[PDB]
Amino acid sequence: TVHDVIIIGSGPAGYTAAIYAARAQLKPLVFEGTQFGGALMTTTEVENYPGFREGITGPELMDQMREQALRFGADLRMEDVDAVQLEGPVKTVVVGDETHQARAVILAMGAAARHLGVPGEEALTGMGVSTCATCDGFFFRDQDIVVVGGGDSAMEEATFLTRFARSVTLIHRRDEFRASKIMLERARANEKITFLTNTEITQIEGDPKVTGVRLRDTVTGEESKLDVTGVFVAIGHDPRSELVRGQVELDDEGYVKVQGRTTYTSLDGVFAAGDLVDHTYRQAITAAGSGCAASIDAERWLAEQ
């Protein structure tokens, strides 16, 4: 059995691709992962996804997406793809000890937001801990919050957040910043931002919601506690391109490269969508749009064969 298309991933990109591919009668085979449903499965309210005047929880939205794909005939498998062979007319994916083949493959594996890896970070996610100022910054009006990170990301998150927060404490483990000079001086100029260099978070405290962070000086080991009600983690993003490295061309940070304003990768018959590709917008709606484009690309490419 060689399927028309296999989709790898189950966030907004993968499900929107599945919906279009299934409605186009391509009978898409979709490997969702055991941690299925993408990044929104790990948040609370999604308010900026257009179509929901009163908002919707992340898992609610993602299950609508999933049931929609099922209704049009997508074959969904809650399993991880462990290896792929993407070159040539017949592509193979390996899932444990099982193999599946297709003429076209849509890569929708997303990007992981780097975690601090400290106690309290996972439990207080959506309860004071966030990875996205555009997404959740709204909810921290007149509060004291922290932003963790030393790059342009952290700089942009911290400066953006000062239009809501009472104060923003920007925490970085070194005394040097990898942020561009312009981004670093914008934050320095902002009166609502205080810099804590040579500082790491060791724990996030909070009884149902974030109430404070425990800090450590990375040079002296001095520790203290900071009273805050928000923690924005901006220590970077890792595109999940490990499966396809050495097969599809990646950029220097691991993102899958695509041709022009399409989803075509460097390999014939292989298309890529979502935050696996986009290091600029990183929203559910942009990921959803690009998964629709990937499926239209694939259908058009399949018709050419």
Ligand X SMILES: Cc1cc2nc3c(=O)[nH]c(=O)nc-3n(C[C@H](O)[C@H](O)[C@H](O)COP(=O)(O)OP(=O)(O)OC[C@H]3O[C@@H](n4cnc5c(N)ncnc54)[C@H](O)[C@@H]3O)c2cc1C
Ligand Y SMILES: O=C(Cn1cccn1)Nc1ccc(O)cc1
Contact residues toward ligand X (CB under 6 A) are: 8-14, 31-33, 35-40, 42-43, 46, 48-49, 80-81, 108-111, 113, 131-132, 135, 240, 243, 274-276, 282-285, 287
DSSP state of 138: G
Q: Which one, 191 or 303, has the nearer CB to its own copies? A: 303
- Confirm whether 251 is a catalytic residue: no
Would you list the DSSP string of 7-57? EE--SHHHHHHHHHHHHTT---EEE--SSTT-GGGG-SEE-SSTT-TT-EE
Q: Which of 105, 107, 235, 288 is the binder for ligand Y (CB under 6 A)?
A: 235
Strands (E) in 81-192, as ranges, are: 83-85, 91-95, 98-107, 111-113, 129-130, 144-148, 167-171
Residues that bind its own copies (CB under 8 A): 12, 15-16, 19-20, 23-25, 47-54, 56, 61, 64-65, 67-68, 71-72, 134, 138, 156, 159-160, 163-164, 182, 186, 261-262, 278, 280-281, 283, 285-290, 292-293, 296, 299-300, 303-304
Q: What CA–CA distance (Å, rounded) separates 122 from 106?
A: 30
Yes or no: say if 4 and 102 are a contact pair by the CB < 8 Å rule: yes
Q: Is the dihedral of CA 294, 300, 303, 305 positive or negative?
A: negative
Backbone angles phi, psi at 186, to 5 degrees: -60, -45
Identified catalytic residue from 63, 75, 80, 132 = 132
Q: How far is the CB of 175 from ligand X (least distance, A)?
A: 29
171 touches ligand Y by CB under 6 A: yes
- Confirm whether 292 is a catalytic residue: no
Q: Three-class SS of residue 110?
A: coil
- Confirm whether 275 is a catalytic residue: no
Q: What CA–CA distance (Å, rounded) separates 147 from 159?
A: 10
Q: Which one, 89 or 117, has the nearer CB to ligand Y? A: 117
Q: How far is the CB of 199 from its own copies (least distance, A)?
A: 26
Going by C-alpha positions, the residue among 91, 120, 119 that lies closest to residue 105 is 91
Identified catalytic residue from 4, 135, 275, 292 = 135
Q: Which of 17, 104, 129, 148 is the binder for ligand Y (CB under 6 A)?
A: 148
Going by C-alpha positions, the residue among 62, 64, 98, 65 that lies closest to residue 80 is 98
Q: Which of 66, 173, 237, 282 is the binder for ligand Y (CB under 6 A)?
A: 173
Q: Which of 24, 56, 95, 118 is the binder for ligand Y (CB under 6 A)?
A: 118
Identified catalytic residue from 4, 136, 275, 278 = 136
Q: Which one, 54 or 252, has the nearer CB to its own copies? A: 54
Give which of ligand Y, ligand X, its own copies, none residue 201 binds (C-beta under 5 to 8 Å, depending on kind): ligand Y
Q: How far is the CB of 41 from ligand Y (least distance, A)?
A: 20
Q: Three-class SS of residue 181?
A: helix
Kindly state the helix (H) or strand (E) to which residue 299 belongs, with its residue range: helix 284-304
Q: Three-class SS of residue 271?
A: strand
Residues involved in catalysis: 132, 135-136
User: Which chain residues interact with ligand Y by CB under 6 A?
Assistant: 114-118, 148, 171, 173, 200-201, 235
